[PDB]
Amino acid sequence: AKHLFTSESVSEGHPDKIADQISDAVLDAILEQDPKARVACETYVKTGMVLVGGEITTSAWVDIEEITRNTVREIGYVHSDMGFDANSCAVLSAIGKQSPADPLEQGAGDQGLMFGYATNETDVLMPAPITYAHRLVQRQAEVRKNGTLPWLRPDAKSQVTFQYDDGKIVGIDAVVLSTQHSEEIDQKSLQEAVMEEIIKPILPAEWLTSATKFFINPTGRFVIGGPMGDCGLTGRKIIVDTYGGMARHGGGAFSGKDPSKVDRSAAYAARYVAKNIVAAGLADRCEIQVSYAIGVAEPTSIMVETFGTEKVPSEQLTLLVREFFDLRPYGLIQMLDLLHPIYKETAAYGHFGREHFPWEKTDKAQLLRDAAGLK
Amino acid sequence: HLFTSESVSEGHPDKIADQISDAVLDAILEQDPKARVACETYVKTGMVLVGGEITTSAWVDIEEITRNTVREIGYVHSDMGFDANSCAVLSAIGKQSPDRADPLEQGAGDQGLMFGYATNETDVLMPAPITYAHRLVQRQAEVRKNGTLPWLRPDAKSQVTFQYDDGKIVGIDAVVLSTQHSEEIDQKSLQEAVMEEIIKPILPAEWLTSATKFFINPTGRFVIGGPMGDCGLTGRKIIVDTYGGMARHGGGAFSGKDPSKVDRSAAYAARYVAKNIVAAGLADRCEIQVSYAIGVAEPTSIMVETFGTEKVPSEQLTLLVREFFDLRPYGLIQMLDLLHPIYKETAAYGHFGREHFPWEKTDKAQLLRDAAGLK
Amino acid sequence: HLFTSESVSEGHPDKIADQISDAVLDAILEQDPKARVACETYVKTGMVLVGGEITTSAWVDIEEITRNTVREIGYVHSDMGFDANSCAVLSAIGKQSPDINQGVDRADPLEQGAGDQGLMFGYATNETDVLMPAPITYAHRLVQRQAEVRKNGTLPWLRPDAKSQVTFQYDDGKIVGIDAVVLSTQHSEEIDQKSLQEAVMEEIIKPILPAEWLTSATKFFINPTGRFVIGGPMGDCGLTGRKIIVDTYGGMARHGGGAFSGKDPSKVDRSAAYAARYVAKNIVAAGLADRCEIQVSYAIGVAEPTSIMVETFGTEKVPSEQLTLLVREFFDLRPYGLIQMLDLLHPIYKETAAYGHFGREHFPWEKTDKAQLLRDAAGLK
Amino acid sequence: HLFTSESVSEGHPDKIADQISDAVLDAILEQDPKARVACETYVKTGMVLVGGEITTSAWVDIEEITRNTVREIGYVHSDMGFDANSCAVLSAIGKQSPDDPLEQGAGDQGLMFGYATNETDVLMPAPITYAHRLVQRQAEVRKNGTLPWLRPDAKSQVTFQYDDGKIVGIDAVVLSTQHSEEIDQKSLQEAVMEEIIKPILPAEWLTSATKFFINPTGRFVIGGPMGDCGLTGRKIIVDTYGGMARHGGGAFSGKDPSKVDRSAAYAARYVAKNIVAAGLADRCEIQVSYAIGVAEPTSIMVETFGTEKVPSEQLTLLVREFFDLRPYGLIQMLDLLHPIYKETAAYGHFGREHFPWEKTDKAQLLRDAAGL
Ligand SMILES: [K+]
Ligand SMILES: [K+]
Ligand SMILES: [K+]
Ligand SMILES: [Mg+2]
Ligand SMILES: [Mg+2]
Ligand SMILES: [Mg+2]
Ligand SMILES: [Mg+2]
Ligand SMILES: [Mg+2]
Ligand SMILES: [Mg+2]
Ligand SMILES: [Mg+2]
Ligand SMILES: [Mg+2]
């Protein structure tokens, strides 16, 4: 049936995403020294200040203030004219610290479930709305940092409404792009530049018609942004972090958490499964639901929803997942080789659909395709 | 096979933050129903930080509201981990003082996407797992406060796992209930009281079988809780707040936001739309997506999904939605009569399924059914 | 012998905190003159924390008062190290309902007991015409002159943070001259040190220090560490009540330990030091001593001071036994008697929080309206 | 006639702050004796904020130091108003990496006072000395189980009467102490008199005239940071001489010894104490003047209040000969680069005769070098 579907993303300068990146920068700095550390780092940013809090158990010694200032500086807040300055904002630490047979048989601590999702409607096997929303704010940051549009400032949001028909994309119905900018540029010039340097190189021409609506800084000037007059907190962008609303989400933020937190690592594993099923050609689109029982390691149930797109029977998919992936809480950590400082890169522009992340590798695809008996 | 949802009591640190954010909201709306409020709370060992931005004529004492909220939750002694009377309360709220000929045509305050959902698998038209998860922790607080089990303490968590078959409920596979308690209670007595006074009054006997597992405090003594050794933030329970994983989410938090914020009010309106479609008998379950562009009053998209359970063509449903509901941002407010101090009640035990909330009324169901030509 | 006193401008981080604390006090007293206020401020890079306890009916916006105060001091850009418009302001003030004890707990409010124990000193000397020690007097005037030329457009490139030191040479108890002068001032990036030193010399130092006391031997040090572009709370920390000697007599006289700023007049740490200055100054203006130091002390809950002591360093012109009598006769040093004697229940305290609480003769504790009564009572003509 | 000084116990909120500031200093100095430290603490209902600036190679856990300090002081329960185990601890310390030194000139036109008098055995003014001993005794009988219902927060004040520089008696004593709910005021007053006041104050100074104000406003159950702020550097007269000597300004706690405000003040005490211990005077205020860029003090005034046993100008020359008062020389003279400062942050920096600036090891040298 014909319908619209919308997703959004936000730049690395958005205050919630600032907090995510600081949490994962702290996490990465600890993991570099202590790969087995327990970290639950929650950040709060607002006018003039960063508060980094939470709980860690580690042998690592890290300078929270330096990590914080370096992270905000890299994002681009370096002057009070932008609303925020990495060099002169307040940084407060409130982190409680503590000192540090078959480990893979560790059972789950909760009744829980995890969702994964993939679809061959894009090259990265992600839903088109979240993919192109991500790409729009990532492009905003790129042309900001490389000097193409030097008047851009870090804070930006995007939103894309796709039209579907019979489950395939027909085009883009509406685009929102709001970006922070310096005082000197006028809105008409800004809108033309955003169209030419951000929107047009990112969105396929075939999907843009004369009916497409473009809302580029629709309320006009956007000089002050980031944390200034606007709070950011770790874990308040969990839908832009994942699938943009296209898939179900069981709850649980990612950033600031070490891989032992099932909320993060099991979600990564569930994406890994779904992406490899679709890359194998076993379905065009796939939502996986992994259920865990308190005190047992293997998932208690694995449901593979294929939305009628399956190329083999649905029971065969469940069995293939049982055979080729280790979805035990600690086994998936080993499968994905997660005990490394790789998380700051995940904390803006999406945890899924990205290049080099281990849960985005399609290295079980051909094995699954063979095992299911097709070519 | 299996589906699990969880809930947390008013004493969970994330929910403490939601309740403080909405108590501030309600205190302001009592004096100034048109106030703009964006209140974000951070709680952890010994402290509450209440931050954000308000535009109002109201005069409120944030510290008093905060201590009162924590006192009502029940944290009143350091032995519990947290004490309303002696914790630190910091305020970082920026205050400003207070556009269309027809206020119904006011543009949205932000972009974003919002989902609503309804299913006839329970009488309140909610998914069963989140419904009974909520009622368990709600019942823990009720018997804690009314004197029945006075040795209970505020922090608690529930998990209910349902078994499905042919898409219908077959029974409850597992129930977890963890509750905080005073040092004098032994676990055996605790488990028996919880089972007698909390679980059995709440879960339907028809869904309890020989295969149903019960886990009461599976990790033993639970004496300190809440913010102690932990950290709670507003808007980190958005799946608990809504449908428990059964339906999708647009990502926006609810608590601390006045009804001009479409993250909250349009999610309420999408629940109202979906619930009225299911109550009309036009679908067995229905999910609504809406989205907005900042400065634009008409939604950038409306999508209705009925999972093949629709009783009239999907195209007719979308038309009925556009005919009978005003989803413009200020249309939402007037449709649901939202400018009242009603929001602290929503900040624990779920925003949906409690049928005295305005977005829970099924007062358009008969109109829809009549317009659809159904008898 | 030599004697040095120092002062700091309104832009020094400790004084920023004193000023915010008294700006909050004044805004409250504007609405509720009987309010109880104990406001303590902490400033450091990027943030202000305003804490304490108030009992008042007033409704004030702590964050707005704080940003306005910082903006007036002049911190408005990250280039300076601190920006009123974008720093963080955290409020941690606990509020209580009344605004004293409703109807006071004494039939005669003059008989109310002290709110705390403690000791307080006051001092006066006829070394200067405002009856203050010279070194702190000229130290204050230097940094006050810095802020004046910065704000009135004379030297717009100055920035808020600044510090002065003045060393006087004494001989036989008399001023012979100024031995050394130190003046460090924050400035914008484009001014070079040589233009800065000459500008400070011509516009700040020479207009303020008496030419008679400056000689070929007087040493002048303008920005002895050179470049001074970032300052204030940046890379530093300011706290209410950490400048209690610059607030009073610059080391020339003793101190009882209590801070002034952020305290309403029911706090004897503040009001009894003001009253002791008023006593000592009226004794010296009366010609009863060339210099005079007063100590008072209180017990919490007790209205009569636990001790009054009058020290005149051998300069008294009548027997000291008579002086102590005159003090008991002409001044009401009970806690609330202090308030009524000096008319303290008014929003006048933010002006005291930089450039010194004493020597500025429009303040009520600087009036010498008892001097002639004292002289007449002592039998002097 | 009368002179009054006060002191406060280790549980008073300002002294809690001083103690946390110097506990952080001590932990840094144990790993890095040359560290630069300027640690400012703010304490209030439910929270400790530890702020400031350090340059050091040391790695310390600010939260653990803070909780350990508050626990030892005795705040361990919300009933007392404050709990080491569950209060908030926030850190905001800026950290820099490490980057003839005895000829270092002063950085400021400075003045430093030191004082001593033989009116007590520790060569301190009597009002501050006995004020300290009262609150220190309060803490001792709280901690050793003698009066276990005492709680940490207490203040003392003592008014002495003088005749011609000599003590004649004590006129007034204030002792206010926090306590548990269950004890009545009458029993508290009797217990405080018998166990705190009478063992500390010499009986020959107490008469029928002496006024005793013991918890004069009654119940004192809530205390410490609860409902009233504590900040580092807000007890600088308690820390020094109780108001008897002049003070040029500048707090001690949280500052490493390279801060002249602290170490030059210690050096001035050391000089004054030895002069009196040598018998060159009975009481003695020393005023040390520094010029910027100059190491040796540019002026040393030795005020003796007419009690000198030797020509007053000899005293200055004896000080020059026997003491190294250059800014970094005095640090060597007093051997200051050691973690000794948390103990100084309650009950006074002067008067306790194990600290280095309280040794009278130059008294015999000064006495021999003079006529005596
Ligand atoms: K957490
Ligand atoms: K400092
Ligand atoms: K205070
Ligand atoms: Mg947000
Ligand atoms: Mg969770
Ligand atoms: Mg949480
Ligand atoms: Mg939002
Ligand atoms: Mg200072
Ligand atoms: Mg000072
Ligand atoms: Mg005081
Ligand atoms: Mg104090």
Residue D278 CA to residue D286 CA, distance in Å, equals 15
Buried b / exposed e along A278-314 (16+ C-beta atoms within 10 A): bbbbbbbbbbbbbbbbbeebbbbbbbbbbeeebebee
Q: Rounded to 5 degrees, what are φ and ψ at C56?
A: -160, 160
- A25, A152 in Cβ contact below 8 A? no
Residue C132 CA to residue C123 CA, distance in Å, equals 8
Residue A219 CA to residue B109 CA, distance in Å, equals 10
Kindly state the helix (H) or strand (E) to which residue D8 belongs, with its residue range: strand D2-8
Task: List, in sequence order, the alpha helices (H) in A201-293.
Answer: 262-279
Q: Rounded to 5 degrees, what are φ and ψ at A179?
A: -135, 140
Residues sharing a CB contact under 8 Å with residue C202, sequence separation 6 or more, in sequence order? none
The burial class, CB within 10 Å (0-12 / 13-18 / 19+), for A325 is: buried
Residue D193 CA to residue C135 CA, distance in Å, equals 46
> Crossing angle for the helix pair C13-31 and C62-73, nearest 10 degrees?
130
Q: Rounded to 5 degrees, what are φ and ψ at C271?
A: -70, -30
Based on C-alpha coordinates, what's the Rg of chain B?
21
Closest alpha carbon to A67 in A34, A15, A100, A32: A32
Residue C181 CA to residue C376 CA, distance in Å, equals 42
> How many C-beta atoms lie closer than 10 Å to residue B238's C-beta?
26
At A37, the amino acid letter reads A
- Nearest residue, CB atoms, A291 vs list B4, B234, B251: B4
Distances (CA, A) of D20 to B279, D35, D63: 63, 17, 10
What are C324's two structure tokens? Answer: 């102590």
Q: Are the Cβ atoms of B61 and C95 closer than 8 angstroms?
A: yes
Task: Name beta bridge partners: C52.
Answer: C39, C93
Ligand closest in space to the Cα of C259 = 10
Residue D317 CA to residue D303 CA, distance in Å, equals 14
Distance from CA of B15 to the nearest CA of D (A): 19
Kindly state the helix (H) or strand (E) to which residue C50 belongs, with its residue range: strand C47-55
Task: Name beta bridge partners: A168.
Answer: A165
SS3 B226: coil
What are D324's two structure tokens? Answer: 């190294």
The burial class, CB within 10 Å (0-12 / 13-18 / 19+), for B166 is: exposed
Measured in whole angstroms, the distance separating CA A216 from the mean position of its chain's CA atoms is 24
Residue D302 CA to residue D46 CA, distance in Å, equals 47
Residue A175 CA to residue A156 CA, distance in Å, equals 13
d(CA A16, ligand 4 centre) in Å:
5
> How many C-beta atoms lie closer than 10 Å to residue D311's C-beta?
10
- B344, B22 in Cβ contact below 8 A? yes
What are A212's two structure tokens? Answer: 């497409």
What are B103's two structure tokens? Answer: 């206020």
> How many C-beta atoms lie closer than 10 Å to residue C203's C-beta?
18
- A235, B236 in Cβ contact below 8 A? yes
Closest alpha carbon to B245 in A252, A237, A127, A240: A252
Closest alpha carbon to C371 in C308, C314, C317, C334: C317
- B238, A251 in Cβ contact below 8 A? yes
At C99, the amino acid letter reads D
SS3 D291: coil
Residue C342 CA to residue C122 CA, distance in Å, equals 15
- D112, D252 in Cβ contact below 8 A? no
**Experimental approach:** X-ray
Measured in whole angstroms, the distance separating CA D20 from the mean position of its chain's CA atoms is 14
Residues sharing a CB contact under 8 Å with residue D344, sequence separation 6 or more, in sequence order? D22, D239, D252, D253, D355
Q: Are the Cβ atoms of D89 and B46 closer than 8 angstroms?
A: yes
Residue D19 CA to residue A169 CA, distance in Å, equals 67
**Best mutation site among B55, B66, B93, B96 for testing chain C: the one with the most C CBs within 10 Å?**
B93
SS3 C211: helix
Edge-first strand order for the sheet with B168-181 is B2-8, B152-165, B168-181, B213-216
d(CA A354, ligand 5 centre) in Å:
25
- Nearest residue, CB atoms, D243 vs list C121, C180, C243: C121
Residue C260 CA to residue C242 CA, distance in Å, equals 10
Q: Are the Cβ atoms of B83 and D86 closer than 8 angstroms?
A: yes
- Nearest residue, CB atoms, B239 vs list A111, A215, A250: A250
- Nearest residue, CB atoms, D49 vs list C42, C113, C301: C42
Q: Rounded to 5 degrees, what are φ and ψ at A163?
A: -100, 130
Based on C-alpha coordinates, what's the Rg of chain D?
21
Residues sharing a CB contact under 8 Å with residue D187, sequence separation 6 or more, in sequence order? none
Closest alpha carbon to D290 in D335, D253, D349, D250: D250
Residue C7 CA to residue C26 CA, distance in Å, equals 23
SS3 B328: coil
Instruction: Name every chain D residue with its beta carbon within 8 A of the beta carbon of A96.
Output: 63
Residue A369 CA to residue D219 CA, distance in Å, equals 80
Task: Name beta bridge partners: C296.
Answer: C120, C308
Q: What is the resolution of this structure in A?
A: 1.9
The burial class, CB within 10 Å (0-12 / 13-18 / 19+), for A143 is: middle
Distance from CA of A155 to the nearest CA of D (A): 26
> How many C-beta atoms lie closer than 10 Å to residue C307's C-beta?
22
Closest alpha carbon to D254 in D12, D19, D34: D19
Closest alpha carbon to C231 in C181, C165, C185, C192: C185
What are C19's two structure tokens? Answer: 């000023």
Ligand closest in space to the Cα of B6 = 5
d(CA B155, ligand 5 centre) in Å:
14
SS3 C36: strand
**Best mutation site among B3, B4, B134 for testing chain A: the one with the most A CBs within 10 Å?**
B4
For chain D, list the contacting chains (3+ Cβ pairs, <8 Å): A, B, C
Residue D220 CA to residue D190 CA, distance in Å, equals 16
Kindly state the helix (H) or strand (E) to which residue D20 belongs, with its residue range: helix D13-31
Q: What angle do CA A143, A149, A150 make, to 5 degrees?
A: 105
DSSP, residue by residue, A325-359: ---SHHHHHHHHT--SS--GGGGSS-SSS-SS-GG
- B355, B124 in Cβ contact below 8 A? yes
Distances (CA, A) of A35 to A27, A265, B327: 10, 14, 49
Instruction: Name every chain B residue with its beta carbon within 8 A of the beta carbon of A46.
Output: 40, 51-52, 92
Tell me the pairing of strands D47-55 and D88-96: parallel
The burial class, CB within 10 Å (0-12 / 13-18 / 19+), for A168 is: exposed
> How many C-beta atoms lie closer than 10 Å to residue D122's C-beta?
16
Tell me the pairing of strands B88-96 and A78-79: unpaired
Residues sharing a CB contact under 8 Å with residue B38, sequence separation 6 or more, in sequence order? A230, A231, B52, B53, B54, B256, B257, B258, B261
Secondary structure tally for chain B: helices H, strands E: 8, 13
Tell me the pairing of strands D230-231 and D211-214: unpaired
- C359, C130 in Cβ contact below 8 A? yes
> CA-based diameter of chain A, in Å?
66
Q: Are the Cβ atoms of B231 and A2 closer than 8 angstroms?
A: no
Distances (CA, A) of D18 to C233, D140, D236: 20, 19, 10
Residue D106 CA to residue C327 CA, distance in Å, equals 43
Sign of the CA dihedral C221, C227, C233, C235? negative
**Locate tokens 């922070």: which residue?**
A180
At D40, the amino acid letter reads E
Q: Are the Cβ atoms of A90 and C234 closer than 8 angstroms?
A: no
**Best mutation site among B43, B70, B77, B86 for testing chain D: the one with the most D CBs within 10 Å?**
B86
Tell me the pairing of strands B2-8 and C76-77: unpaired
Distances (CA, A) of C279 to C118, C134, C366, D4, D294: 18, 19, 9, 18, 40
Ligand closest in space to the Cα of D237 = 10
What are C181's two structure tokens? Answer: 């002068």
Residue A255 CA to residue D129 CA, distance in Å, equals 56
- D177, D192 in Cβ contact below 8 A? yes
- B35, B58 in Cβ contact below 8 A? yes
> Crossing angle for the helix pair B262-279 and B314-324, nearest 10 degrees?
120
DSSP, residue by residue, A10-64: E-TTSHHHHHHHHHHHHHHHHHHH-TT-EEEEEEEEETTEEEEEEEEE-S----H
What are A316's two structure tokens? Answer: 């065969």
Closest alpha carbon to B53 in B21, B99, B27: B21
Three-class SS of C154-182: CCCCEEEEEEEEEEEEEECCEEEEEEEEE
- D336, D26 in Cβ contact below 8 A? no
Residue C62 CA to residue B93 CA, distance in Å, equals 10
**Locate tokens 């003082």: which residue?**
B97
Closest alpha carbon to B174 in A111, A108, A295, A296: A111
- D4, D159 in Cβ contact below 8 A? yes
Distance from CA of D232 to the nearest CA of A (A): 18
Q: Are the Cβ atoms of B301 and A112 closer than 8 angstroms?
A: no
Ligand closest in space to the Cα of D18 = 11
Residues sharing a CB contact under 8 Å with residue D37, sequence separation 6 or more, in sequence order? D24, D25, D28, D29, D52, D53, D54, D56, D254, D255, D256
- B143, B197 in Cβ contact below 8 A? yes
Ligand closest in space to the Cα of A44 = 4
- A16, A347 in Cβ contact below 8 A? no
DSSP letter (8 states) at residue A254: -
- C294, C121 in Cβ contact below 8 A? yes
**Locate tokens 């600044």: which residue?**
C162
- B28, B259 in Cβ contact below 8 A? no
Instruction: Name every chain D residue with its beta carbon within 8 A of the beta carbon of B83.
Output: 78, 83, 86
For chain A, strand residue ranges (E) read 3-10, 38-46, 49-57, 78-79, 84-85, 90-98, 112-119, 152-165, 168-181, 213-216, 232-233, 285-292, 301-305
SS3 D359: coil
Task: List, in sequence order, the alpha helices (H) in D209-358.
Answer: 260-277, 312-322, 329-334
Closest alpha carbon to D16 in D79, D66, D77, D87: D66
- A71, A33 in Cβ contact below 8 A? no
Distances (CA, A) of D10 to D69, D174, D340: 10, 17, 16
**Best mutation site among C90, C96, C97 for testing chain B: the one with the most B CBs within 10 Å?**
C90
DSSP letter (8 states) at residue B126: S
- C110, C337 in Cβ contact below 8 A? yes
> CA-based diameter of chain C, in Å?
66
What count of Cα atoms within 13 Å lies in the side-chain half-sphere of residue D143?
16
Distances (CA, A) of B119 to A320, B47, B205, B287, C88: 32, 40, 21, 9, 46
Q: Are the Cβ atoms of A92 and D91 closer than 8 angstroms?
A: yes
Measured in whole angstroms, the distance separating CA C106 from the mean position of its chain's CA atoms is 32
Task: Name beta bridge partners: A302.
Answer: A290
For A89, left (φ over 0), alpha (ψ -120 to 50), or beta?
Answer: beta
Closest alpha carbon to D239 in D107, D111, D341: D341
- A82, C78 in Cβ contact below 8 A? no
SS3 D322: helix
For chain B, list the contacting chains (3+ Cβ pairs, <8 Å): A, C, D
The burial class, CB within 10 Å (0-12 / 13-18 / 19+), for A186 is: exposed
SS3 B227: coil
